[PDB]
Amino acid sequence: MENFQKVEKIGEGTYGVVYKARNKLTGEVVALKKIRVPSTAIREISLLKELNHPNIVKLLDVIHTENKLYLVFEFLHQDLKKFMDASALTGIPLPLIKSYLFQLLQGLAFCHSHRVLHRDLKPQNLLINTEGAIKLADFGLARAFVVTLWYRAPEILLGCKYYSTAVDIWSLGCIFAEMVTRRALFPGDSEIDQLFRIFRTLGTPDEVVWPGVTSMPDYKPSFPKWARQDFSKVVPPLDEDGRSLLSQMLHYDPNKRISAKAALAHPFFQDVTKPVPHLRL
Ligand SMILES: CNS(=O)(=O)c1ccc(N/C=C2\C(=O)Nc3ccccc32)cc1
């Protein structure tokens, strides 16, 4: 669009490139996403514009010109990944971790109530500002249409084609653990490796802990049998309230995994506050 001046490439995505750009007709700074056009996609994207919430990156406009699609979003200066790297030596203080988690759950609860899944949550999709807020980006873009498998729910890796809102809670749980320990929970480099790293930590699932798991499309009776490890070993500094919530976010059975709404009332958030982080832009 000749109506936008590309400032710089912010990065590539699962559905296109993202640029920081200025709207020559408004002077506004925005995030321009050039998508890499089906009618359903246009309508699916159209719904996302009505999805307004303080913890969701706002979709400002949809420009469909010359059979090409560009999405205009609000712009935030930093993603959680860069923030974690910058805090690698000291770690993110618990009060801030708690604040970010609490806000993300509010965001997810809102999206889920409208039946909008993410299905691709990860640090690069979480944006923060100088105000202490954090927002979900690239929401609901999955349905409308090497990649990291570190945050993928087990039901997805096992071939379930009708996943639910529970897949986002799983990803959030992985991110939660990563902020606390400062290291990826399940850093797999292939689908099977990802699955096995999960099994080696939470134990290989069976019919007892996950009814119907052995009927999943990609389930194999030949999977190695690993025992479950203790969470005190997995996320050390995290207190009992935190470990309790994390475990409910990482239940194998999607139906027993905690929902965003229920997680918001968990004791872990009893003392939540909204600290302002020290950001270097
Ligand atoms: C990786 N470098 S960084 O931290 O400087 C950095 C800076 C800005 C952004 N912003 C990205 C985005 C933004 O603001 N709005 C979006 C809507 C959809 C997808 C990505 C975005 C992401 C990362």
Curated annotation (Swiss-Prot):
Outcome after substituting K9F: Reduced phosphorylation by CAK
Site (CDK7 binding): K9, K81, K82, L149
Modified residues (Phosphotyrosine): Y15, Y19
Cofactor mode of binding and number, as noted: Binds 2 Mg(2+) ions.
Induction of expression: Induced transiently by TGFB1 at an early phase of TGFB1-mediated apoptosis.
Chain positions with N6-acetyllysine modification: K6
UniProt main location, coarse: cytoplasm
PROSITE patterns: PROTEIN_KINASE_ATP, PROTEIN_KINASE_DOM, PROTEIN_KINASE_ST
Subcellular location: Cytoplasm, Cytoskeleton, Microtubule organizing center, Centrosome; Nucleus, Cajal body; Cytoplasm; Endosome
InterPro entries hit by this protein: CDK, Kinase-like_dom_sf, Prot_kinase_dom, Protein_kinase_ATP_BS, Ser/Thr_kinase_AS
Posttranslational mods: Phosphorylated on Thr-14 and Tyr-15 during S and G2 phases before being dephosphorylated by CDC25A. Nitrosylated after treatment with nitric oxide (DETA-NO).
SMART domains, per database record: S_TKc (SM00220)
EC number: 2.7.11.22
GO annotation, biological process: cell division; cellular response to nitric oxide; cellular senescence; centriole replication; centrosome duplication; chromatin remodeling; DNA repair; DNA replication
Residues recorded as bearing Phosphothreonine in the entry: T14
Binding site for Mg(2+): N125, D138
Molecular-function GO terms, alphabetical: ATP binding; cyclin binding; cyclin-dependent protein kinase activity; cyclin-dependent protein serine/threonine kinase activity; magnesium ion binding; protein domain specific binding; protein serine kinase activity; protein serine/threonine kinase activity
PTM sites of type N-acetylmethionine: M1
Cellular component aspect of the GO annotation: Cajal body; centrosome; chromosome, telomeric region; condensed chromosome; cyclin A1-CDK2 complex; cyclin A2-CDK2 complex; cyclin E1-CDK2 complex; cyclin E2-CDK2 complex
Quaternary structure and partners: Found in a complex with CABLES1, CCNA1 and CCNE1. Interacts with CABLES1. Interacts with UHRF2. Part of a complex consisting of UHRF2, CDK2 and CCNE1. Interacts with the Speedy/Ringo proteins SPDYA and SPDYC. Interaction with SPDYA promotes kinase activation via a conformation change that alleviates obstruction of the substrate-binding cleft by the T-loop. Found in a complex with both SPDYA and CDKN1B/KIP1. Binds to RB1 and CDK7.
Name this protein carries in UniProt: Cyclin-dependent kinase 2
